[PDB]
Structure 1
Amino acid sequence: ASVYAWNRKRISNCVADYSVLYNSASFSTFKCYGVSPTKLNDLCFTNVYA
């Protein structure tokens, strides 16, 4: 979607492998703010939104 009508998808009830996101070189910017990128596999979350 366009940026004025940006699409919000709920992520819930899943096990997430962020290591395929860290190890992929396709992303020009992979920058996390309130959490380390390598600790994402060690934590549990709710209210995940893309």
Structure 2
Amino acid sequence: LYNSTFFSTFKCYATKLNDLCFSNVYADSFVVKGDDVRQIAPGQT
């Protein structure tokens, strides 16, 4: 999934593929604006 340029961000909060080792990992799916992808980020209150 990560080795692809069909996508825009891959922003994780690469080190992103070895940091990814935890419990139940989700796939929270939703429709955003481009002004709303900006705040799919920790905090952004």
Higher relative CO (CA 8 A, sep ≥ 6), structure 1 or 2?
Answer: 1
Relative to its length, the structure with more helix (as a share) is 1
Relative to its length, the structure with more strand (as a share) is 1
TM range (shorter): 0.3 to 0.5
Task: Name the TM-score, length of structure 1 as normaliser.
Answer: 0.37
